[PDB]
Amino acid sequence: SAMVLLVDDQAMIGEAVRRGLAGHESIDFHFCADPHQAIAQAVQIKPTVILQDLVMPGLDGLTLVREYRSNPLTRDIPIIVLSTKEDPLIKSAAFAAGANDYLVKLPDNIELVARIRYHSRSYMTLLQRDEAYRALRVSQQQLLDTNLVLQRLMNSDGLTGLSNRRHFDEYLELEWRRATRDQAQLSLLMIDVDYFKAYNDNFGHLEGDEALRQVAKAIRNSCSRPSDLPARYGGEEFAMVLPNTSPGGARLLAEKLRQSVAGMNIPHIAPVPGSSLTVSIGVATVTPQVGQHSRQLILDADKGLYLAKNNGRNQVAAG
Amino acid sequence: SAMVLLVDDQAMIGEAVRRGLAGHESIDFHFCADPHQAIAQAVQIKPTVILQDLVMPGLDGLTLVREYRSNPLTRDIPIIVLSTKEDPLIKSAAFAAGANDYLVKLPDNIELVARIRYHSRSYMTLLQRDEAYRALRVSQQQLLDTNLVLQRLMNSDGLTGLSNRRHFDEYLELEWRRATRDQAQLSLLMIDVDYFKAYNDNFGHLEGDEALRQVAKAIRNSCSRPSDLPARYGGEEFAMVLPNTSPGGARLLAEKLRQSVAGMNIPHIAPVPGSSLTVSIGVATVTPQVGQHSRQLILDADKGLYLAKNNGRNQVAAG
Amino acid sequence: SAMVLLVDDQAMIGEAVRRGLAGHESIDFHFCADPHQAIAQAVQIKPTVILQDLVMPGLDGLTLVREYRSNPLTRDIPIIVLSTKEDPLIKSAAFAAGANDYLVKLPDNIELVARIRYHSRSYMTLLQRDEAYRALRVSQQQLLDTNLVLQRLMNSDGLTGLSNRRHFDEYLELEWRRATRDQAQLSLLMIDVDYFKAYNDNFGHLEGDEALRQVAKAIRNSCSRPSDLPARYGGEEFAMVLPNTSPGGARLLAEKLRQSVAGMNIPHIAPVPGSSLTVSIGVATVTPQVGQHSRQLILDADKGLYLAKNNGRNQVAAG
Amino acid sequence: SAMVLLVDDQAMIGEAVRRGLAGHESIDFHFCADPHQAIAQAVQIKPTVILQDLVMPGLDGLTLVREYRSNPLTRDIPIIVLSTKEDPLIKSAAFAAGANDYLVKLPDNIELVARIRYHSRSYMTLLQRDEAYRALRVSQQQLLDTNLVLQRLMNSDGLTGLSNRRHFDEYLELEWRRATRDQAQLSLLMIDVDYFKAYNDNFGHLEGDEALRQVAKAIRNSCSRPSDLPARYGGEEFAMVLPNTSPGGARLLAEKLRQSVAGMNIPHIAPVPGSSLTVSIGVATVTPQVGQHSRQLILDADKGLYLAKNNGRNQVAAG
C-alpha cells in the first residue's frame, strides 16, 4: 500500500496534497500541521514516505528531519522535503539532514504521485526484505536442529553412540567400491562379547547395556583414522571397518583392543567365578576386485570370529 | 556495493562523473558514450543505477529510457535522467518514460553521490528481498515434505496405515482427559484376529500381513466420527477409541465390524478346514473421574476381549 | 544343531553312544569319562543335552546333577540320567535333583536319538526365545527414542516449545470437525507482539528470540484445559485454539494473558523510550456448520487482531 | 501356565489325574473320555501337553497320536502316551507316531507333575519364541522404512535428489581429512546457473525448479567414481566434490559438464532473446596439509566461479 505523512504549517498545502491523492485508493494521506506531534503520528500511522516543510511555526523543519533519521522507529522512512523556494545550503542541508528529496511546493499531481509512489514502494520492499530475513532465519534454524536429530539418530546407535547397523552396511558398501578403485587393503573387525547371555542373566539387562557401553567406548578408542568406522553390528556384536589397513595392521589393532577390554577388568561370573568380561574378535582383510561382492569380507571376518571363539574366547583370529 | 552506468554523448560529462566518484571505493563508475551499446553494457556490468542523458548523437534519450523499463533484465534498475536544461514535457516525459529522477548536469558531488547512493541502495535491497523470497520458498518447501514424512510415519503404522501404538497411547491419554472434563462416555474396542499364528504358519508371514491389511481396512470403515481413532495396538491386535459413544452404541459398532470381517470370507484352515478369518472383540466404556487412570478402560476392554475369546471366538463381549 | 555331553565312568557306554550317533550329522557327541571335568567341559562345548550316569568312580552322579542345575551356565540344559538299573528313590531323586529323564543304558538307537533330539531341540528354542527377547528389547527401545525425537520435533516449535504451525493447522482442522458435530463454541486467539521489528533491531535477533520465549511461556500459562492448544503461528505470531469456550470466556482469557505480558515489564524502546513489551490479540469464536470452512474462524481472529492493532496496540478486540 | 488334556476311555484314569493335579493352581486339567472329540477339544482349550491312552473304546490310540502330529493346530503340542503296560513295538511305535513319552498309568504325583511341568513349559517357550519372531519382524520392518525416509531425506535435496548442503558440508569435511592423510588431490566444482533470477521471473518459480532439475541431472551424470559427490549447494548453486582428482582432470570434467548443460539448449531470454540456459563453474583443487581448514578449498572454487562469471558466463575458470 502507501501512506504519506504530510507535515506543513499551512493548511493550504495539506489541502493541495489531500486533493492530489483523493483519486488514488492505493495511497492514503495524513496531514500533520502541528510539528510537535510529527514524530508521534509518524510512529502511530506507519507512513511509507513523509513530506516535510522546511519552515514552519517557529520550529526548524530540518530539526525534524534530524529526529526522523534519529529515532529508529522512523530511521528508514523516505523523506521528501517541501521547500519554498530553492535556497542554497537548505538544499545541501536537506540531504545533510537526511532528506532524500527537495521539492518546491508543488509539482503537478503526476510527478507528485510518481515521486511518492517510488520512495513509498522502496521502503515497502525494505520492510519486506527484513521480514524475509527473519522468516528465513527461522526456517534455517528449524532445519538447523532437524538436521542434528535425524543425524545423531539415523546413523548412530543410541546406547553406545557407535554407528548403527544400517550405517555400517551402507558405509561398508561405499568403502568396498572406493577400495576396489584404489586396489587398497580393506580390513574388517568382527567383535563379540564372550558369555554375554550369561552376563545379561545374573546382572540384569541394564547392567549388560552398561557393559556394552564400556566395551563400545574401548572400540571407539582403538581406531582413529578419518575412515575408521566403529559400529554396533547387532546387539552384543560390534564391527569396525578399517580402510587402507594391512592384515598385520588390522591384527595389531585387534590385539590392542582385546587387551584393552580384558584390562578394564569387568566382573563376570563366566566361564568361572572370578572372571572378567572378555571379547572375541574376527579379523579379515581384502583387496576387492570388480564383480566381487562385499559379503566376502564379512564372511571372512565371521570365520575368524568363529575360530577365535572355538579356541578359548578372549582372543583374535583371522578368518 | 554500487555501480553507476553513465550514458552520455559528451566525454566531458563522463569525465566529471568519473572524477566525482574516484574518491569513493564503495561505488564504481562505468561510462557508456555509445548509446547503441547502452542496454548491452547494462546487462553485462549489472549496474545498480544508471544516469541517462536526454539528448545524444541522433538517438532519443527517452527511447533508451523506454528500453530500460522494457527489457526486464534492466526493468528494475533505478534511472536518473541527466538533462540540459529544464524543458517542460521533457521532465514530465522523463517520468512517463520511467525515469525516477531528472537532474541538471551536474549538481555538486554531494547531492550527486547522495542521490546515487539512495537509488543504488534501494535496488540493492530489492535484489535482496527477491533473493530472500527464493531462499525462503526453498526452506519452506523443505519443511513442507519434512512434515509429510515424520507425520505419515510418526503416527501411522506403515502396514495398515491405521494409527500406531504410541499414537494410540498418547491419543487415548488425551481423550481420557477430554472425557473427564465433559463427563462423557469414552468407549474402547480391543480387536484380535482369531487363530492368527495358525494363519501365519501355513500361508506365510506376508500373506498374514496382507490379511492384517484387509482387516485393518474394515476397522477403518467401521468408525467415521471426527474423534474415532483406529489403531494397530500391536501385531495381530487392533484398537479403536470411540469418544462420546454409549456402551450400546459401541457394541452395535463392534458387531457390524465383526460381521464385516467374517463376511469378507477370507480362507483359513483353523479352527477346522473350510474356515474363514474371524475376529474377537472386547468392548468397554467408561465415564472418567478425576484421579482415575485411563488403564482402567484398557483392562475392561481386555476382560471383554478375553471373554469373547473364551466363548468361541468370532464374537463381541463387554468386559 | 545338537550336542550331547555323555558323562559315564565306563568307556563301553561312551562307545555305544558314540556309535549310535555316528550316522547322524545333525548331532555331535562328546564323551566325558572324568566326572571331575564334567561341568568344565559342559561350559566349553555348549551341549544341548547331557547324559548322566548315576554311579561313577567314587563321585555321586546326583551330586553332578546338583551342580548342573546349580551353575547357571548349565542351569537350562536338559539332563537325561543314565542308570543301571531302576532302583526307587534314585528315579525319584533323579527328578528331585533336576533330571528330566531316567533311562536304562541303553534303549535302542531310535528312542535314544528321539529323546536326545527332543530335549536338545527344546533347549535350542529356549536359547532362541531368549535371543529374540534381547533383540526385540533393542528394536523396541530404538523405536522408543525414535518416537521422542520426531514428536518433540514434528509437532513442537523448538524455540518456544509451543505447538508449531503445521500442528496448529492440522489440530485446528480436527477441532473444527469435532466442534461442528457437537455444535460447540470454538474460540481462537491470534496473538502478536507489538513493535517487534523495532525490538529485534536494537536488541538483537537472539534477544528477540528470548523475548519470544518469555511471551510463549505466558501463553502456555493462560490455557489449561485438555484441548486448549497454544501455538507459534509464524514468527512473532502466536495462536491459541480454545475448544468449548464462549466468546466472553475467550475474551476474559485473552485479557488475563495480555495483562500478564505487559506485567512482565520487558524493556522496549518503542513506541517511545521507557516502554515495555506489549501484545495485541484478536479474539474470534464460532459454532461451525456443515460445509463451513475453518478459515472463517481464522479470518475473524485476524479482523480482531487488526482492530486491536489499529486502536493503540496492547489490547484485545473481537473480530 | 499349564493345561493338560487327558484322553482315556476309563473314568478311573481321568479321576486319578484330576486328583493329582487339584493341589496345583499353576496347572489345569481337562478330561476327554470320548476319543471322537479329542482333537476338537485340543483345538478349543489350547492344551500345553496331552496325555494319550494307547487302547480305548475301539479307536486306535496311535491313530490319534497320528492326527495330533498331523493337524498343525496341534502339531507342536507335546504328547505323553499312557500305556498299560510296556509292550514292544508299542513303545517304539509311540515315538514313530510322534509320542514324546511313554508312561505306565501312573507314576506317582511327583514324576507325573514333573514330566507334565517340563513338556508343558517347553511348548510354552516354543510359543514365546514364535511370538517374539513375529514382534521382532514387525519392529525390524518398522526400522526398515524408518531408515529409508530419514536417509532419502536427511542427506538428499528433495527437488534435485543430489546431496543437500549439510551432507555436502559434512561429507567434504570428511574427505578433507581423508585427503590430508593420503596427501591426495582433492578437487571441488562450484556451479551456478547464469541469469537465474531472470529465468525465474518470466518463466515461473516452478519452471525454474524444473530447470534446476534438468541441470541437476547433468551434474549427476558428469561424475561417476565411488567418492564423487554432487550436491545442491544452495538454491541456484550446485557443488561437486571430487576426491583424488587432478586440477587438469577436474577442469576436463568441468568442461564436459558445462558443454552438456548448454547443449540441452534450454530456452532463456537472457542475456538476450534466443539464449539458452548456461552455467558458470569455479574449479579448485588442493592437497590438504595438517592444520589447514577445508574452507580454503571452497574459497578457491568461489574465486574461480567469480572469475568465470566476470569473463562472460557459460565458462569454466580455476580460482
Ligand SMILES: Nc1nc2c(ncn2[C@@H]2O[C@@H]3COP(=O)(O)O[C@H]4[C@@H](O)[C@H](n5cnc6c(=O)[nH]c(N)nc65)O[C@@H]4COP(=O)(O)O[C@H]3[C@H]2O)c(=O)[nH]1
Ligand atoms: N571414460 C571414463 N569412465 C570413467 C572414469 N572414471 C569412472 N568411470 C565410469 O564409471 C564406471 C566405474 O566407476 P568405478 O566405481 O570407479 O570402479 C572401477 C574401478 O574400481 C575399476 N577401474 C576401471 N578402470 C580403472 C582405472 O583406469 N584406474 C583405476 N584406479 N581403477 C579403474 O573398475 C571398476 C569399474 O570399471 P568401469 O566398468 O570401466 O566403468 C566405469 C566408467 O563407465 C574415467 O576416468 N573415464
Ligand SMILES: Nc1nc2c(ncn2[C@@H]2O[C@@H]3COP(=O)(O)O[C@H]4[C@@H](O)[C@H](n5cnc6c(=O)[nH]c(N)nc65)O[C@@H]4COP(=O)(O)O[C@H]3[C@H]2O)c(=O)[nH]1
Ligand atoms: N585403520 C587404522 N589402523 C591403525 C591405527 N593405529 C595403528 N594402525 C595399524 O597398525 C599399524 C601401525 O601401528 P603403530 O604401532 O601405531 O606405529 C605407527 C606410527 O608410529 C607411525 N604412524 C602411522 N600413521 C600415524 C599417525 O597418523 N600419527 C602418528 N603419531 N603416527 C603414525 O607409523 C607406524 C606404523 O604405520 P602403519 O604401517 O600405518 O600401520 C598401522 C595400521 O595398519 C588406526 O587408528 N586406524
Ligand SMILES: Nc1nc2c(ncn2[C@@H]2O[C@@H]3COP(=O)(O)O[C@H]4[C@@H](O)[C@H](n5cnc6c(=O)[nH]c(N)nc65)O[C@@H]4COP(=O)(O)O[C@H]3[C@H]2O)c(=O)[nH]1
Ligand atoms: N480458576 C480456573 N481454573 C481452571 C479452569 N479450567 C481449567 N482450570 C485449571 O486446570 C486444572 C484442571 O484442568 P482439567 O484438565 O480441565 O480437568 C478437570 C475436569 O475434568 C474437572 N473439573 C474441575 N471443575 C470443573 C467444572 O467447573 N466444569 C467441568 N466441566 N469440569 C471441571 O476436574 C479436573 C481437574 O480439576 P482442577 O484441579 O480444578 O484444576 C484445574 C485448574 O487449576 C477455569 O475455568 N478456572
Ligand SMILES: Nc1nc2c(ncn2[C@@H]2O[C@@H]3COP(=O)(O)O[C@H]4[C@@H](O)[C@H](n5cnc6c(=O)[nH]c(N)nc65)O[C@@H]4COP(=O)(O)O[C@H]3[C@H]2O)c(=O)[nH]1
Ligand atoms: N464413535 C462412533 N459411533 C458410531 C458410529 N456409527 C454408529 N455409532 C454408534 O451406534 C449408534 C447409532 O448407530 P445408527 O444405527 O448409525 O443410526 C444413527 C443415525 O441414523 C443417526 N445419526 C447419528 N449421527 C449421524 C451422522 O453423523 N450422520 C448420519 N447420516 N446419521 C447420524 O442417529 C442414529 C443413532 O445415533 P447414536 O445415538 O449417535 O448412537 C450411535 C453410536 O453410539 C461411528 O461412525 N462412530
Ligand SMILES: Nc1nc2c(ncn2[C@@H]2O[C@@H]3COP(=O)(O)O[C@H]4[C@@H](O)[C@H](n5cnc6c(=O)[nH]c(N)nc65)O[C@@H]4COP(=O)(O)O[C@H]3[C@H]2O)c(=O)[nH]1
Ligand atoms: N448411518 C450413520 N452414519 C454416521 C454416524 N456417525 C457419523 N456417520 C457418517 O460419517 C459422516 C459425517 O461424520 P461427521 O464428521 O460426524 O460430522 C457430522 C456432524 O457434524 C453433523 N451430523 C449429521 N447428523 C448428526 C446427528 O444426528 N447428531 C450430531 N451431534 N451431529 C450430526 O453433520 C456432519 C456430517 O453429516 P453426514 O453427511 O450425515 O455423514 C456422516 C455419515 O455418513 C451414525 O451414527 N450413523
Ligand SMILES: Nc1nc2c(ncn2[C@@H]2O[C@@H]3COP(=O)(O)O[C@H]4[C@@H](O)[C@H](n5cnc6c(=O)[nH]c(N)nc65)O[C@@H]4COP(=O)(O)O[C@H]3[C@H]2O)c(=O)[nH]1
Ligand atoms: N479454553 C479455556 N477457557 C478458560 C480457561 N480458564 C478460564 N476460561 C474461560 O473463562 C471462563 C471462566 O473463567 P473463571 O474466572 O476461571 O472461573 C471459573 C471457575 O471458578 C469455575 N471452573 C470452570 N472449570 C474449572 C476447572 O477445570 N477448575 C477449577 N478450579 N475451576 C473451574 O467456573 C467458573 C467459570 O466457568 P466457565 O464458564 O467454564 O468459563 C470460562 C472459560 O470460557 C482455560 O484454562 N481454558
Ligand SMILES: Nc1nc2c(ncn2[C@@H]2O[C@@H]3COP(=O)(O)O[C@H]4[C@@H](O)[C@H](n5cnc6c(=O)[nH]c(N)nc65)O[C@@H]4COP(=O)(O)O[C@H]3[C@H]2O)c(=O)[nH]1
Ligand atoms: N601411534 C599411532 N597413532 C595414529 C596412527 N594412525 C592415526 N593415529 C592417531 O590419530 C591422529 C591423527 O589421525 P589423522 O586423521 O590420520 O590425520 C593425520 C595425517 O593426515 C597426518 N599423519 C601423521 N603421521 C602420518 C603417517 O606416518 N602417514 C600418513 N599417510 N599420514 C600421517 O597427520 C595428521 C594428524 O597427525 P597426528 O597428530 O600424529 O595424530 C594421530 C594419532 O594420534 C598410527 O598408525 N599410530
Ligand SMILES: Nc1nc2c(ncn2[C@@H]2O[C@@H]3COP(=O)(O)O[C@H]4[C@@H](O)[C@H](n5cnc6c(=O)[nH]c(N)nc65)O[C@@H]4COP(=O)(O)O[C@H]3[C@H]2O)c(=O)[nH]1
Ligand atoms: N572424480 C572423477 N574424475 C573423472 C571422472 N571421469 C574423468 N575424470 C577426470 O578426467 C580424467 C580422465 O578423463 P578420461 O578422458 O575419461 O579418460 C580416462 C580413461 O580412458 C581411463 N580411465 C580412468 N579410470 C577409468 C574407469 O574407472 N573406467 C573406464 N572405462 N576408464 C577409466 O584413463 C583415462 C584418464 O585417467 P585419469 O587420469 O583418472 O583422469 C581423469 C579424472 O581426473 C569421474 O567420473 N570422476
Ligand SMILES: [Sr+2]
Ligand atoms: Sr511554511
Ligand SMILES: [Sr+2]
Ligand atoms: Sr547531450
Ligand SMILES: [Sr+2]
Ligand atoms: Sr557306572
Ligand SMILES: [Sr+2]
Ligand atoms: Sr484303556
